[PDB]
Amino acid sequence: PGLFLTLEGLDGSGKTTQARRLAAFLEAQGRPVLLTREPGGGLPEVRSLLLTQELSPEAEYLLFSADRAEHVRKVILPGLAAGKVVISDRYLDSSLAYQGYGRGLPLPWLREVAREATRGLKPRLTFLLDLPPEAALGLEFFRRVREGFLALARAEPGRFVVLDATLPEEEIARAIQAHLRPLLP
């Protein structure tokens, strides 16, 4: 059956660190794990394309989406099918927060693109590492992005678990572990 988990937040929020520690904890539990990330998990070359100077928000989202489509199809769905716990460091919510809340793109369009792109795959849980924006385009943009993530979590409070990114790393990892314990047996 597998289990799909994501870690989200601004760059420098510790989401990469936590993804990694989660992968290792679950592994010690004897659970097969597949650790992945966006962007690049589908099309590693998308990382080049994404840095294009003055890229329109629409084009940026579409590149993220192309990578995501490939990632879901070639990496994530097959990992779940094999019974793995698949953990992604960034997924759809990142796009929604950066390209939607940050760059202003309409959420409904983002979600319609995403519906075929992802084959409707949602994570069972998403751990949001909430980081003050000054610790991450400029400050106004990162404020919109930070708040955007918080908006998405309010909106799907069953799937999101919001954690304070300024806590010590080992306390964050323990909180992730406690939200996860019920879903393992």
Report helix, strand or coil for 37.
strand
**108 binds Mg ion per the rule CB under 5 A:** yes
Question: Residue 104 annotated as binding?
Answer: no
Q: Closest Cα partner for 94 from 169, 19, 22?
A: 19
The angle formed by the CA atoms of residues 106, 112 and 115, to the nearest 5 degrees, is: 140
Q: Are the C-beta atoms of residues 92 and 118 closer than 8 Å to each other?
A: yes
Question: Environment class of residue 75 by beta-carbon count within 10 Å: exposed (0-12), middle (13-18) or buried (19+)?
Answer: middle
Question: Environment class of residue 120 by beta-carbon count within 10 Å: exposed (0-12), middle (13-18) or buried (19+)?
Answer: exposed
Beta bridge partners of 85: 3, 33
Min. distance of Cβ 19 from Mg ion in angstroms? 11
Beta bridge partners of 130: 164
Q: Applying CB under 5 A, which of residues 13, 18, 99, 126 lies at the interface with Mg ion?
A: 126
Q: Closest Cα partner for 126 from 83, 166, 155?
A: 155
Binding positions for a second copy, 50-79, rule CB under 8 A: 52-53, 55-56, 58-63, 65-67, 69-70, 73-74
CB closer to a second copy out of 75 and 167: 75
String of contacts with Mg ion for each residue 49-68, x by CB under 5 A: ----------------x--x
**101 binds Mg ion per the rule CB under 5 A:** no
Select from a second copy, Mg ion, none the partner in contact with residue 73, using the beta carbon and a kind-dependent cut-off of 5 to 8 Å.
a second copy
CB closer to Mg ion out of 112 and 164: 112
The footprint of Mg ion (CB under 5 A) covers 6, 8, 65, 68, 91, 93, 108, 111-112, 114, 117, 126, 147, 150-151
The footprint of a second copy (CB under 8 A) covers 42-43, 45-46, 48-49, 52-53, 55-56, 58-63, 65-67, 69-70, 73-74, 105-106, 109, 112-113, 115-117
Point out the annotated binding site. 9-16
